[PDB]
């Protein structure tokens, strides 16, 4: 097992056909999970399941530039469950990050940060036990 928050370096940045796979289990009474693809201090893609935002479960995605959050993209389809094991796969495509959870397509996030090769770290945080975090080229 891995210590959370965990930093996964992405050597040379991301590129299309790179597949990141994260395996873990949601804690009991979880509040939030976050994946943060970073370009230095900037967050190119923040993927943030929220377990109780005004008694709703929602995934919020966004980008942070110069310490400012941008326009949120919100998904009400919510495949995570407190206490249960999950798999998140993020496939870098030419125009977007493509996210699947437990083998089912979830969402796509169009590239706002376009210098893909400068997105050099992935932070994994929140209310999880982290089992593995890896990448491969498909
Ligand atoms: C909770 O713990 C941590 C730890 C590290 C980093 C964060 C960053 O969390 C922020 C991030 O998820 C951004 C993504 O857009 O949202 C921030 O929250 C927003 C919130 O989503 C907005 N809610 C709505 C309903 O629009 C709110 N909007 C208004 C008008 O207030 O704005 C906040 C602040 O940007 C979240 O803090 C978290």
From Swiss-Prot:
Domain Galectin: 6-136
Keyword entries, A-Z: Acetylation, Cytoplasm, Differentiation, Disulfide bond, IgE-binding protein, Immunity, Innate immunity, Lectin, mRNA processing, mRNA splicing, Nucleus, Phosphoprotein, Repeat, Secreted, Spliceosome
BP GO terms, sorted: eosinophil chemotaxis; epithelial cell differentiation; innate immune response; macrophage chemotaxis; monocyte chemotaxis; mononuclear cell migration; mRNA processing; negative regulation of endocytosis
Positions that bind a beta-D-galactoside: 69-75
Motif (Nuclear export signal): 114-129
GO CC, alphabetical: cell surface; collagen-containing extracellular matrix; cytoplasm; cytosol; extracellular exosome; extracellular region; extracellular space; ficolin-1-rich granule membrane
Residues recorded with modification Phosphoserine: 76
Lineage: superkingdom: Eukaryota
Alphabetized GO MF terms: carbohydrate binding; chemoattractant activity; disaccharide binding; IgE binding; laminin binding; molecular condensate scaffold activity; protein phosphatase binding; protein phosphatase inhibitor activity
Tissue: A major expression is found in the colonic epithelium. It is also abundant in the activated macrophages. Expressed in fetal membranes.
Subcellular location(s) of the protein: Cytoplasm; Nucleus; Secreted
Known partners and oligomeric status: Probably forms homo- or heterodimers. Interacts with DMBT1. Interacts with CD6 and ALCAM. Forms a complex with the ITGA3, ITGB1 and CSPG4. Interacts with LGALS3BP, LYPD3, ZFTRAF1 and UACA. Interacts with TRIM16; this interaction mediates autophagy of damage endomembranes. Interacts with cargo receptor TMED10; the interaction mediates the translocation from the cytoplasm into the ERGIC (endoplasmic reticulum-Golgi intermediate compartment) and thereby secretion.
Its job: Galactose-specific lectin which binds IgE. May mediate with the alpha-3, beta-1 integrin the stimulation by CSPG4 of endothelial cells migration. Together with DMBT1, required for terminal differentiation of columnar epithelial cells during early embryogenesis. In the nucleus: acts as a pre-mRNA splicing factor. Involved in acute inflammatory responses including neutrophil activation and adhesion, chemoattraction of monocytes macrophages, opsonization of apoptotic neutrophils, and activation of mast cells.
Protein name as catalogued: Galectin-3
Positions spanned in the full protein: 113 to 250 of 250
């Amino acid at each position: 097992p891995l210590i959370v928050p965990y930093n996964l370096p992405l050597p040379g940045g991301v590129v299309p056909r790179m597949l990141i796979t994260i395996l873990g289990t949601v804690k009991p009474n979880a509040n939030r999970i976050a994946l943060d693809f970073q370009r230095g201090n900037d967050v190119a893609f923040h993927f943030n399941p929220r377990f109780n935002e005004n008694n709703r479960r929602v995934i919020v995605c966004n980008t942070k530039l110069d310490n400012n959050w941008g326009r949120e993209e919100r998904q009400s389809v919510f495949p995570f469950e407190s206490g249960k094991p999950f798999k998140i796969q993020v496939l870098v495509e030419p125009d977007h990050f493509k996210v699947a959870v437990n083998d089912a397509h979830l969402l796509q996030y169009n590239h706002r940060v376009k210098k893909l090769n400068e997105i050099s770290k992935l932070g994994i945080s929140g209310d999880i036990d982290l089992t593995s975090a890896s990448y491969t080229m498909i």
